[PDB]
Scaffold this active site. Structure first.
Site, PDB file in Angstrom:
ATOM      1  N   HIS B  83       0.797  -1.228   0.000  1.00 48.90           N
ATOM      2  CA  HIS B  83       0.000   0.000   0.000  1.00 48.90           C
ATOM      3  C   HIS B  83       0.830   1.278   0.000  1.00 48.90           C
ATOM      4  CE1 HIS B  83      -4.409  -1.050   0.946  1.00 48.90           C
ATOM      5  NE2 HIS B  83      -3.840  -2.088   0.360  1.00 48.90           N
ATOM      6  N   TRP B 296      -7.042 -16.534   1.410  1.00 48.00           N
ATOM      7  CA  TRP B 296      -6.787 -17.024   0.056  1.00 48.00           C
ATOM      8  C   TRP B 296      -6.205 -18.433   0.036  1.00 48.00           C
ATOM      9  CZ3 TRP B 296      -5.290 -12.041   1.513  1.00 48.00           C
ATOM     10  CH2 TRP B 296      -6.058 -11.021   0.963  1.00 48.00           C
TER      11      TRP B 296
HETATM   12  C1  HEM Z   1      -5.909  -5.538  -7.774  1.00 47.64           C
HETATM   13  C2  HEM Z   1      -5.031  -5.860  -6.811  1.00 47.64           C
HETATM   14  C3  HEM Z   1      -5.475  -6.100  -5.346  1.00 47.64           C
HETATM   15  C4  HEM Z   1      -6.705  -6.061  -4.775  1.00 47.64           C
HETATM   16  C5  HEM Z   1      -8.091  -5.774  -5.395  1.00 47.64           C
HETATM   17  C6  HEM Z   1      -6.527  -6.365  -3.367  1.00 47.64           C
HETATM   18  C7  HEM Z   1      -7.490  -6.438  -2.402  1.00 47.64           C
HETATM   19  C8  HEM Z   1      -7.166  -6.801  -1.115  1.00 47.64           C
HETATM   20  C9  HEM Z   1      -8.048  -6.726   0.006  1.00 47.64           C
HETATM   21  C10 HEM Z   1      -9.505  -6.227  -0.083  1.00 47.64           C
HETATM   22  C11 HEM Z   1      -7.377  -7.149   1.097  1.00 47.64           C
HETATM   23  C12 HEM Z   1      -7.910  -7.260   2.537  1.00 47.64           C
HETATM   24  C13 HEM Z   1      -7.704  -6.035   3.421  1.00 47.64           C
HETATM   25  C14 HEM Z   1      -8.322  -6.401   4.758  1.00 47.64           C
HETATM   26  O1  HEM Z   1      -9.590  -6.472   4.868  1.00 47.64           O
HETATM   27  O2  HEM Z   1      -7.577  -6.626   5.741  1.00 47.64           O
HETATM   28  C15 HEM Z   1      -6.039  -7.505   0.682  1.00 47.64           C
HETATM   29  C16 HEM Z   1      -5.077  -7.984   1.548  1.00 47.64           C
HETATM   30  C17 HEM Z   1      -3.758  -8.273   1.358  1.00 47.64           C
HETATM   31  N1  HEM Z   1      -3.024  -7.930   0.235  1.00 47.64           N
HETATM   32 FE1  HEM Z   1      -4.201  -7.426  -1.512  1.00 47.64          FE
HETATM   33  N2  HEM Z   1      -5.194  -6.566  -3.108  1.00 47.64           N
HETATM   34  C18 HEM Z   1      -4.528  -6.420  -4.292  1.00 47.64           C
HETATM   35  C19 HEM Z   1      -3.196  -6.550  -4.472  1.00 47.64           C
HETATM   36  C20 HEM Z   1      -2.204  -6.909  -3.608  1.00 47.64           C
HETATM   37  C21 HEM Z   1      -0.822  -6.842  -3.987  1.00 47.64           C
HETATM   38  C22 HEM Z   1      -0.376  -6.326  -5.383  1.00 47.64           C
HETATM   39  C23 HEM Z   1      -0.101  -7.279  -2.929  1.00 47.64           C
HETATM   40  C24 HEM Z   1       1.442  -7.378  -2.787  1.00 47.64           C
HETATM   41  C25 HEM Z   1       2.231  -8.064  -3.621  1.00 47.64           C
HETATM   42  C26 HEM Z   1      -1.034  -7.614  -1.861  1.00 47.64           C
HETATM   43  C27 HEM Z   1      -0.746  -8.122  -0.617  1.00 47.64           C
HETATM   44  C28 HEM Z   1      -1.713  -8.353   0.339  1.00 47.64           C
HETATM   45  C29 HEM Z   1      -1.539  -9.028   1.611  1.00 47.64           C
HETATM   46  C30 HEM Z   1      -0.239  -9.646   2.158  1.00 47.64           C
HETATM   47  C31 HEM Z   1      -2.901  -8.964   2.310  1.00 47.64           C
HETATM   48  C32 HEM Z   1      -3.248  -9.561   3.693  1.00 47.64           C
HETATM   49  C33 HEM Z   1      -3.174  -8.495   4.791  1.00 47.64           C
HETATM   50  C34 HEM Z   1      -3.232  -9.142   6.164  1.00 47.64           C
HETATM   51  O3  HEM Z   1      -3.005 -10.380   6.294  1.00 47.64           O
HETATM   52  O4  HEM Z   1      -3.508  -8.410   7.146  1.00 47.64           O
HETATM   53  N3  HEM Z   1      -2.328  -7.402  -2.303  1.00 47.64           N
HETATM   54  N4  HEM Z   1      -5.937  -7.264  -0.678  1.00 47.64           N
END
Ligand code: HEM
Ligand code: HEM
Lengths: 715, 715
Positions: B83, B296
């Site tokens: 982010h 996931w």
């Molecule tokens: C179109 C691209 C993406 C969409 C729509 C998306 C959407 C989301 C959403 C909605 C969450 C959950 C937030 C929450 O409720 O805690 C999430 C979590 C997460 N994202 Fe993505 N995301 C995207 C791309 C990415 C990318 C590019 C990365 C890094 C390479 C990434 C790494 C992560 C990780 C590690 C979490 C888990 C956070 C946790 O465990 O607290 N995401 N993403």
């Protein structure tokens, strides 16, 4: 909503948020002059008589784009100088001719500063010639002084040295989002502090009477009060108004809806000019400025007693200018054709404003002006003294007044101090006096609180206040609640005087020390003592040369405005502050001319030093008192502490640890530094593990900056 | 309406006014480190192994106030780091993790950055230990990298060097005055430039698909477009989503209506924290962040191929999270119990976002991911590359990358340049080549306009562009319409290349010269020759070391965002600009890292020198072209000249003299300096009688700045 280049920002998402940019006004990067520039040096070398001559050439050289009334811009330039100084107010000392602000927003586009935009444009060839050596600030008010002398009035004198600025001074002028709006009165007719005008965009009062009602008796109550709030008494007020309306005329030749946008709203091609008029030629003969068409005197370009000879000479009846504005004309067609037209036309009849008649209808103004009717020399005297005060009010210590026209006469309103009459304490004497103060029984808290009490009464707006004068032991400062009179202050004062007496008796050569310096030095001595308790060996810089003023050199009423209703550096909150504590802290820090880094070290330092009002535990996040550590920062960042608004809702908070027990208590001022994302950033700097040496360095620089705030005698 | 300390100011009176404060961002006075603070030198001293070990200790130490999912903050930090980097955008170069802006408004309080407030708070213990040797900006993204590496993904590398800022970079994020608002699309789908997200306060796209509509096919078009506008092609995009979603979970246990105000709007006692929830314990197993409940993979704290095995291993049916969020779950009860609970609870079924499904519903993504289903090693390889790029896109030139973890490999997106092959041109050779460029018969305009074309391609947002690489002779820069390719450019390239050969293959010695600095040097010799024509003997300073890139080292579509649709310094204004010319000038000057003083002297300087696009006479307020004078400044303040818009309303103006003949023509860009109250102040400095040496002195310091903006290879 918008691009940053067009104004969009974080304020748009959170309208009420703490605006930290008040702590970086006029940043060096915005300044084109370079770091080594010193205006004082430049203007001290200016040829005053060449300058005056060139101004007098501008005043009598009419320009086609704004033809000169009676072939003399003089009256136009006295109004310019009067309006530039005329924004000053006592509550916070902001406004005034000091920074040349009339050239910027919003002042350059105030409805009351209409046609001043051309007025300053006429002075460009003077600035052109004199360059670096002459600030617009200095020129704007000097042009008025020259106007006065050009037309027959011997002024008491003039001080150069107003430093030109590069972006506007952010001043609260009132809450009205409408020009000429009035939302500033409560009670009978209590005007909102800090304001000193009756409506938004006006200097003092309505030229057509309160709320547009041409009642001279009522108007006088508005003139009395606005002028009071600009440091002007009854005699000064009267003197100024008659002195002023002795020259020139008002401008209201056509309807005001025929006049275009103010300079800030106006087309690019207008080159900074505003209020462009479509009435006839829209200038000179056809000039609409206020909408009032008045020529007070038969000699609008000469100083004489005509103003009062007319005011008392005719009877007055209500009437309308060609724009529908209220004004007074002489009854029964009397004085038909005695007043001259600006551009050669036929003579006019006597006219006055509602406000001019206030001088005749108000009991007090009556006694004053009828006296000068019969004794015209007393008017010149009183106008001379008042005009000097008007345009110098906000220049602070007389040390700042530069040039060959600065008179020797000391003025009470300049809050004068004695000249240095003995040799100053050198290095050995300072080290001696530090040890003595440390051996005196006085505590770190006492010395640091007293030192801070004295220096932080300074405000950067008008440059009044500060440690110089040793006024802390005089009224009113000795009895200020924040200085906590019934507290230790008198024990500290008596002790410092005894040391002063001790040193001055035993002293070598012709070296003598003032009480004023000792107060500050006690602070410096105590900060050294605390630093060592915390394992740091630094010496706190001291600059001698403060002198002690007498009660008679200290106007008690004038110093009343300098009393803090809040001081976040002492965790003081009195009653009546416009905003919550944390907003009053930024304002207090802005008044002390502090950066956000500088404000931050001072709060944290002062808390653990024990500077808090009434020695309250609020924000004293330390186990070791009398010790200069970064403990405040370390603890505010500690996540083991859970913060909750106190049960007994009193503006305080409770910091509870893991067990549930309260460890810390805080004010809003204290918590804001853990809360505000930008202040927290600064706290994470001085709260780091490597940070304590840097905290001591920066606290000491900050503290020294504050002790030296009023020291223009050594700059 | 408001106090300055509550944000009140001139914009309230004039909402669309040019806001010059964009030109004094990060004022030195708001910076607590000191003028002499050198971050490079600090971070050079860090133990990166000890840092990593401390970061690892943070990731595995759950804190009561935000307990760790699966006992590991790794994935939260990956999202935080993702982010941080993920606000970047190609059109502007603005956004990115390069300033650690996510700790300030408005990004700290974005809907999409929810619970990242807690993630950064968790890093304090590290920042506290390291102090000035570690910026937040470096720590935020490095925690992400460490996370990956701790959970079993070997990353390509990392570079330190991101300097912490002290006030929020104000960036245009969209029109919307509502959070999650969308007013940025026209036509089928065309997204508003310069934006790279689909709603206000989102990083890329809606997790629930376009406008909450969970169409995976449609969401893919949005992922493609936002990811493109952040410099990612299909492979990188797919590698990133897969790579990230290998880790952690979404949080939507209860209702969003039970989650509190964001950090900027939250009560002091929360200490810069926000979105405090009243659902259950409000944290951990009850944590709500987006409203989605998706885990996931089955090993959320481990790197493997299970994201793709799950995405393809099941069939996905639309469902609702406990908070009424659209999401997918495996049809037919399949994979029941297989996905672990963050806090010990029972197993749960497979789930995927709508955007996750985009990866197997979209033809292009599908090819790409279905390959990696059986070839995970290619996913590892592509993710490592993409993550590295993601975390470094705004780092600028590779010279800025610090620490023991920077990899040797050149990458095309870093817009690389050859190392310095042989010896650098010394003082003799500089002045020799100088004389030789003046004796070239290339004109002052030619030399200056070419040198500006090159250097002013730079933007300090992502630190891309500039005169290093000698890319002015390469595509697409040699085609850029502002660089006016159908004019002199080719001839200037030819002639400088000719001199390059002549100098290199003249005298044997070790000294060689590149075309890159010969363009800059030629501009510098022209400005020396111009200053001689107006009677100044000056040496324009010049630093060598620029090297020539090849077309093969120049990504033509990547350089296409670096193209000016407006350059006020060359009085060029193309179509498609969001704002009028004078605003585009201030934005330009902001990207060139210029101050208002610097902008001012450069325009008037470049106007008279002949640097104007198509050599138009607009703003060329001089009688003697190719001569360096303050003429522009003198003449814009001439009141004998009357300005009116041109009868052919072409954005141009005419300046007529007393006789009614046009003497000058100018654009918006030119007259803004004579119109704007703050910009006029500056031109009144440079246009006064004593100013010419100061103008020249300042023009050259400002010029040498623009030439050197690139040159992190030498600072
Ligand atoms: C179109 C691209 C993406 C969409 C729509 C998306 C959407 C989301 C959403 C909605 C969450 C959950 C937030 C929450 O409720 O805690 C999430 C979590 C997460 N994202 Fe993505 N995301 C995207 C791309 C990415 C990318 C590019 C990365 C890094 C390479 C990434 C790494 C992560 C990780 C590690 C979490 C888990 C956070 C946790 O465990 O607290 N995401 N993403
Ligand atoms: C009771 C407070 C005052 C009021 C209500 C007031 C009002 C006015 C008005 C309405 C005008 C006409 C402006 C125009 O249309 O051109 C004017 C002009 C003028 N004022 Fe006053 N004024 C006040 C105090 C003063 C003071 C204290 C001075 C200076 C000592 C002063 C000096 C002048 C001069 C020299 C002009 C003539 C301008 C010209 O000839 O172009 N006034 N005043």
């Amino acid at each position: 909503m918008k691009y940053p280049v067009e104004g969009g920002g974080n304020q748009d998402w959170w309208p009420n948020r703490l605006n930290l940019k008040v702590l970086h006004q006029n940043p060096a990067v915005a300044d084109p002059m370079g770091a080594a520039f010193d205006y004082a040096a430049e203007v001290a070398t200016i040829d005053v008589d060449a300058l005056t001559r060139d101004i007098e050439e501008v005043m009598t050289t009419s320009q086609p784009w704004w033809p000169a009334d009676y072939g003399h811009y003089g009256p136009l330039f006295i109004r310019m100088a009067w309006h530039a100084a005329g924004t000053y107010r006592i509550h916070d000392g902001r406004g005034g001719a000091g920074g040349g602000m009339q050239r910027f927003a919003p002042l350059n586009s105030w409805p009351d500063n209409a046609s001043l935009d051309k007025a300053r444009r006429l002075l460009w060839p003077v600035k052109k010639k004199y360059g670096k050596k002459l600030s617009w600030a200095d020129l704007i008010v000097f042009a008025g002084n020259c106007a006065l002398e050009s037309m027959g009035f011997k002024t008491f004198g003039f001080g150069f040295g107003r430093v030109d600025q590069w972006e506007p001074d952010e001043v609260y002028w009132g809450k009205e989002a409408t020009w000429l709006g009035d939302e500033r009165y409560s009670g009978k007719r209590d005007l909102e502090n800090p304001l000193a005008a009756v409506q938004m965009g006006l200097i003092y009062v309505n030229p057509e009477g309160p709320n547009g009602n041409p009642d001279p008796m009522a108007a006088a109550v508005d003139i009395r009060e606005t002028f009071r709030r600009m440091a002007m008494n009854d005699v000064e007020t009267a003197a100024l108004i008659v002195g002023g309306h002795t020259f020139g005329k008002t401008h209201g030749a056509g309807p005001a809806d025929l006049v275009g946008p103010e300079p800030e709203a106006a087309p690019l091609e207008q080159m900074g000019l505003g209020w462009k008029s479509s009435y006839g030629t829209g200038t000179g003969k056809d000039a609409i400025t206020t909408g009032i068409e008045v020529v007070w005197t038969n000699t609008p370009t000469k100083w004489d007693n005509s103003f009062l000879e007319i005011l008392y000479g005719y009877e007055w009846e209500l009437t309308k200018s060609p724009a529908g504005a209220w004004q007074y004309t002489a009854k029964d067609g009397a004085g038909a054709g005695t007043i001259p037209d600006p551009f050669g036309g036929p003579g006019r009849s006597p006219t006055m404003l509602a406000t001019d008649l206030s001088l005749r209808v108000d009991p007090i103004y009556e006694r004053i002006t009828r006296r000068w009717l019969e004794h015209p020399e007393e008017l010149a005297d009183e106008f001379a003294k008042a005009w000097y005060k008007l345009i110098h009010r906000d220049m602070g210590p007389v040390a700042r007044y530069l040039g060959p026209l600065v008179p020797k006469q000391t003025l009470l309103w300049q809050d004068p101090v004695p000249a240095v009459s003995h040799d100053l304490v050198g290095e050995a004497e300072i080290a001696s006096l530090k040890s003595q103060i440390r051996a005196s029984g006085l505590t770190v808290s006492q010395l640091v609180s007293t030192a801070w009490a004295a220096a932080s009464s300074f405000r950067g707006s008008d440059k009044r206040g500060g440690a110089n004068g040793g006024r802390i032991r005089l009224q009113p400062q000795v009895g200020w609640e924040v200085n906590d009179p019934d507290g230790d202050l008198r024990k500290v004062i008596r002790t410092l005087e005894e040391i002063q007496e001790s040193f001055n008796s035993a002293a070598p050569g012709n070296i003598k020390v003032s009480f004023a310096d000792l107060v500050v030095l006690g602070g410096c001595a105590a900060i050294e003592k605390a630093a060592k308790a915390a394992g740091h060996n630094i010496t706190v810089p001291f600059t001698p040369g403060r002198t002690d003023a007498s009660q008679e050199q200290t106007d008690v009423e004038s110093f009343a405005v300098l009393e803090p209703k809040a001081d976040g550096f002492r965790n003081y909150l009195g009653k009546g502050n416009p905003l919550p504590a944390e907003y009053m802290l930024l304002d207090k820090a802005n008044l002390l001319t502090l950066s956000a880094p500088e404000m931050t070290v001072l709060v944290g330092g002062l808390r653990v030093l024990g500077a808090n009002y009434k020695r309250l535990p609020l924000g004293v996040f330390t186990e070791a008192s009398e010790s200069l550590t970064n403990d405040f920062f370390v603890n505010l960042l500690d996540m083991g502490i859970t913060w909750e608004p106190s049960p007994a809702d009193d503006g305080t908070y409770q910091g509870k640890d893991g067990s549930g027990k309260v460890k810390w208590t805080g004010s809003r001022v204290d918590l804001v530094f853990g809360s505000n994302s930008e202040l927290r950033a600064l706290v994470e700097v001085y709260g780091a593990d490597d940070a304590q040496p840097k905290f001591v360095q920066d606290f000491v620089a900050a503290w020294d900056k504050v002790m030296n705030l009023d020291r223009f005698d050594v700059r």
